[PDB]
């Protein structure tokens, strides 16, 4: 089993709408949800960080505490499971800065994930999004060996991404379409 | 004439608010809607949840946190300056007796006649799961025409969520 990030309806849409708003600037925000299995990360919600490029310095500790404090008053009390950021027109990949930013997220929680969206490429009719973690310290699968090596090469690897919707969201989605 | 355009994200957020607060049979959730009222068609593109309690036995008793509106709205402005506070939402299923009074309070946060969207989170229903209202003297609620609109980015999102 592959490690998989399950993205909720509202998390996907809020990331797409924020990233598209920020174009041509890179934007970022935090991801809320839970870690489950070794192989499961659930992203239930996200929220935007104000603009200031994207780095640890863009993470506004007071904005974040105040957001989490208010969210908790309205029944949203999930921990931060990582962060997302757009890059408009470049693929989904981490630069050296993103890796440092992720290192810092990882220090807090070894399981944190980095989500990268490209909102410009998404309007081709396909959502371009991926998730990543860093990789720290007879029968095989050839393709997975090939990915552990390209991963080792660049210091991070990608996770599978899936979308979760409840049966009531599905019904609502089908009337919004 | 007067039309309302609603982004999909808005209806999914109200449903996620209703469900995450374990909102009881007969009870409701309430929040704020943001967008652009500066045209003949009011565009609703965002929302946030409010702490709200009312008395099941006594429709004239209810509490809405005023500090939370100002404090959340000031955080929304830091993300999107053009996304104004334009009205409010509740999960219904129908208009309540206190709604005109509540609507009055929201006048102090909007620069338009506040829009009330009633979101059907019970799915008991054949099409668009939100009805829009505006208070007028002609005081009473006027039902408005409403339709779905979101920017290209969200529309691809929705299709990806169904196809996936």
């Amino acid at each position: 089993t592959k490690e998989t990030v399950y993205i909720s309806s509202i998390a996907l849409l809020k990331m797409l709408k924020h990233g598209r708003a920020g174009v041509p600037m890179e934007v970022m925000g935090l991801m809320l949800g839970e870690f489950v299995d070794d192989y499961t990360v659930n992203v239930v919600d996200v929220f935007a960080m104000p603009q200031s490029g994207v780095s640890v310095e863009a993470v506004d500790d007071v904005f974040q505490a105040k957001m989490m404090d208010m969210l908790k008053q309205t029944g949203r009390d999930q921990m931060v499971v990582g962060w997302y950021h757009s890059h408009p027109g470049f693929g989904c990949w981490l630069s050296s800065v993103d890796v440092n930013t992720q290192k810092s997220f990882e220090q807090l929680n070894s399981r944190a994930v980095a989500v990268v969206v490209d909102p410009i490429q998404s309007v081709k009719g396909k959502v371009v999004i991926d998730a990543f973690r860093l990789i720290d310290t007879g029968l095989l699968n050839k393709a997975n060996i090939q990915a552990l090596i390209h991963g080792l090469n660049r210091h991070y690897y990608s996770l599978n991404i899936d979308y979760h919707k409840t049966a009531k969201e599905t019904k609502m989605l089908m009337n919004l379409h | 004439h007067e039309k309302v355009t609603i982004a999909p994200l808005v209806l999914l957020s109200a449903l996620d608010h209703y469900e995450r607060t374990q909102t009881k049979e007969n009870k409701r959730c309430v929040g704020v809607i943001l967008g652009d009222a500066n045209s003949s068609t009011i565009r609703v593109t965002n929302s946030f949840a409010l702490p709200f309690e009312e008395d099941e036995k006594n429709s004239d008793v209810w509490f809405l946190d005023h500090n939370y509106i100002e404090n959340m709205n000031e955080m929304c402005k830091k993300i999107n300056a053009k996304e104004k506070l334009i009205g409010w939402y509740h999960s219904g299923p129908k208009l309540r007796a206190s709604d005109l009074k509540i609507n009055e309070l929201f006048k102090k946060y909007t620069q338009n006649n506040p829009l009330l969207l009633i979101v059907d989170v019970k799915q008991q229903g054949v099409g668009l799961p939100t009805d829009a209202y505006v208070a007028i003297e002609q005081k009473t609620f006027l039902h408005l025409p409403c339709t779905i609109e979101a920017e290209e980015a969200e529309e691809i999102g929705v299709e990806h969520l169904l196809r996936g």
Partner: nanobody
Amino acid sequence: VQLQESGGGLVPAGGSLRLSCVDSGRTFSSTVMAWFRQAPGKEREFVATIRWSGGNTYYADSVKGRFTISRDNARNTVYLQMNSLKPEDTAVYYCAGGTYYGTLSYKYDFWGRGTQVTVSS
């Protein structure tokens, strides 16, 4: 109603019970099943969860080493084997289905009516 739990009742402290849940599967799909429990005056609390296929499981801290969740795929049944029961384990127990692999109750799609478990004090 699509799910229907059984097993459960009164048992002394230190005792054992096996809960079961049958899914008719005539309205709702599910790739995940879970147990939850609700004590009088308390929030519904996640107990355990399992995927129909593969059968990967995950448990609440207070229940690890004592409770086992398992499933009979072909018979569409989930089981909770509860060993070393304590008074604090007393609650109505609910099986729940949906597509979400995790602990949040409002991510689940449908519920049984519940079965009462009472562990003598």
